[PDB]
Amino acid sequence: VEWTPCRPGGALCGKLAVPVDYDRPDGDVAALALIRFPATGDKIGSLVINPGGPGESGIEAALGVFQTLPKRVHERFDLVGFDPRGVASSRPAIWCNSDADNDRLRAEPQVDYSREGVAHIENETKQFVGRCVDKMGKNFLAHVGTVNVAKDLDAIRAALGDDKLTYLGYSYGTRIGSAYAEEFPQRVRAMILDGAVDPNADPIEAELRQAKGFQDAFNNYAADCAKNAGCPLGADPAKAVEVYHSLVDPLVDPDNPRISRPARTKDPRGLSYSDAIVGTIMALYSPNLWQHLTDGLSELVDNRGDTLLALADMYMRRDSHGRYNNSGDARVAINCVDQPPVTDRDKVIDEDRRAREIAPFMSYGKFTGDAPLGTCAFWPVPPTSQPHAVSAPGLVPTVVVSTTHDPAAPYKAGVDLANQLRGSLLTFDGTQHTVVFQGDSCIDEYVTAYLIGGTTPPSGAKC
């Protein structure tokens, strides 16, 4: 990789060629984008980070992480972000939906699970898959999966001149981590895994624990808001779910679930039911966003929807010109090859029955007896990984950071990953998804000590 300056730091940029298919070593080729912020002091190596998703840009994440990086880390490490194969600035980039395709889905309330509703959703799904194949070809899609990003990560390690990898992964970046740990355990100098994915989980039970996580975060958000003057969910947090629904339900036509009655916004779209749910979910990733959820709900009281719409736009990555980045398309293409899809209708139907009970804030109306299959049930290329316990006996001690009321990656999944990896579990008491290098000096101190001196937190460490 030959480096060159960028388009906000002392940043350098470059690309790295990797083979699309590691079994056809000089067939089709992909170019991974990389960003590098040079160390200011005595350089141990490169700190490579990944923000998760999947589909989220590691380059953009390095730019954010740069501002909140502790001084000692910035001294001792080159901070490095990369865009995984198929993501953001990497070529070729996964593209399925036009900007108009995405807007058209988001205008639908998406709550009709009658047989006609399910059939409509599954038709939309088939057309999406068709568009992915038409724009990407089956070969590239076959190989965007995590098992191949781990291989790219080793090529990135070498390209950067590091003997052993120093790695921080958030969320899905955790799955990149444990996959790299299994294929290249002798190249791991150090590894922090914040907001963990347990690679051994059943797909459906993990989704239901995730639904429970968001419902618990909602409960926490509502209890907090209940102490505050003018709470749009009312002063009784046991009635918050009902009050929430009195606010979002009218966004759907009560006699015909397929008809949206969007809340008025200054934007021409207005706020559909589905965007109201998505904006709420976005807000529950962090208490930093609870003020916005409160504003957006206050707006709904007046039949207005601007803040919830901007919250959903943040989640979907739609900028102010109506253009989407590719994170949405990429997320799906990657998830669909990372494990066997659930194709059994009865399991999907029963998952829906339970989720309505576990997370009623997310659920509209009553169980109908039907539910749609996920996009992955229709994917034309097969899974290139499968659930299993992480086994990497020779691996250096690692740190798994896990937040007690993390909605997206529940506490217990971090515990289980730490067990499998036989590394240290660092606990953060809070209701947010991830926490490393995001303000908290106690967490950042443990992580700094581990990154430089190799020192792990003691058993039962809390922050």
Q: In whole angstroms, give the CA distance from residue 288 to residue 319.
A: 21
Is residue 194 classed as helix, strand or coil in its secondary structure?
A: strand
Q: In whole angstroms, give the CA distance from residue 320 to residue 266.
A: 12
Q: Are 126 and 158 in contact (CB under 8 A)?
A: no
Q: Which of 90, 171, 178, 286 is an active site residue? A: 171
Q: In whole angstroms, give the CA distance from residue 383 to residue 392.
A: 22
Strand 29-37 relative to strand 77-82, pairing: antiparallel
Select from 373, 375, 433, 426 the least CA-distant residue to 397: 426
Q: What is the dihedral of CA 222, 244, 352, 119, to 10 degrees?
A: -150
Is residue 184 classed as helix, strand or coil in its secondary structure?
A: coil
Which amino acid is present at 115?
Answer: R
Q: Are 387 and 202 in contact (CB under 8 A)?
A: yes
Strand 424-428 relative to strand 77-82, pairing: unpaired
Q: Identify the experimental approach.
A: X-ray
Q: Are 251 and 257 in contact (CB under 8 A)?
A: no
Q: In whole angstroms, give the CA distance from residue 45 to residue 38.
A: 10
Q: Are 48 and 84 in contact (CB under 8 A)?
A: no
Select from 120, 126, 127, 125 the least CA-distant residue to 370: 120
What are the phi and psi torsion angles at 405 (to 5°)? -125, 45
Q: Which of 406, 416, 424, 444 is an active site residue? A: 406
* Domains with residue ranges and CATH for the chain: 12-92+144-201+395-453 (3.40.50.1820), 95-141+228-379 (no CATH)
Instruction: Record the resolution, in angstroms.
Output: 2.3
Q: Is 320 a catalytic residue?
A: no
Q: Are 146 and 171 in contact (CB under 8 A)?
A: no
Cis peptide preceding 237, ω within 30 of 0:
no
Q: Are 463 and 439 in contact (CB under 8 A)?
A: no
Q: Is 313 a catalytic residue?
A: no
Beta bridge partners of 82: 34
Q: Are 198 and 342 in contact (CB under 8 A)?
A: no
Strand 424-428 relative to strand 45-50, pairing: unpaired
Q: In whole angstroms, give the CA distance from residue 317 to residue 328.
A: 8
Angle of helix 115-142 relative to helix 327-338, nearest 10 degrees, comes to: 80
Token pair belonging to 369: 């007896």
Q: Are 201 and 387 in contact (CB under 8 A)?
A: yes
Which amino acid is present at 367?
Answer: F
HSE-CB of 440 using CA atoms within 13 angstroms? 16
DSSP 249: G
Q: Are 165 and 48 in contact (CB under 8 A)?
A: yes
Q: Are 154 and 180 in contact (CB under 8 A)?
A: yes
Q: What is the end-to-end Cα distance of the chain in Å, rounded?
A: 40
Which amino acid is present at 96?
Answer: C
Which amino acid is present at 369?
Answer: G
What are the phi and psi torsion angles at 372 (to 5°)? -80, 150
Q: In whole angstroms, give the CA distance from residue 181 to residue 432.
A: 26
Got the DSSP string for 31-49? EEEEEEE--SSS--EEEEE
Q: Which of 78, 313, 363, 433 is an active site residue? A: 433
Match 């990898």 to its residue by tokens: 165
Select from 286, 263, 282 the least CA-distant residue to 273: 263
Is residue 271 classed as helix, strand or coil in its secondary structure?
A: strand
Strand 399-403 relative to strand 424-428, pairing: parallel
Q: In whole angstroms, give the CA distance from residue 414 to residue 395.
A: 17
* Cα 246 to Cα 4, 249, 301, 366, distances in angstroms: 55, 6, 9, 15
Select from 368, 433, 424, 431 the least CA-distant residue to 397: 424
- Can you say how many angstroms the Cα of residue 328 is from the centroid of all Cα atoms in its chain? 10
Strand 29-37 relative to strand 12-19, pairing: antiparallel
Token pair belonging to 161: 């001149």
Q: In whole angstroms, give the CA distance from residue 314 to residue 316.
A: 6
Got the DSSP string for 333-366? HHHHHHS-----HHHHHHHHHHHHHH-GGG--S-
Token pair belonging to 209: 């624990």
Q: In whole angstroms, give the CA distance from residue 379 to residue 102.
A: 19
Find the farthest-apart pair of alpha carbons in the chain and give their distance in angstroms, rounded. 68
Sheet of strand 45-50, all strands in order from the earlier edge strand to the far edge: 12-19, 29-37, 77-82, 45-50, 165-170, 188-194, 399-403, 424-428
Q: Is 433 a catalytic residue?
A: yes
* Cα 1 to Cα 20, 35, 84, 405, distances in angstroms: 18, 11, 16, 41
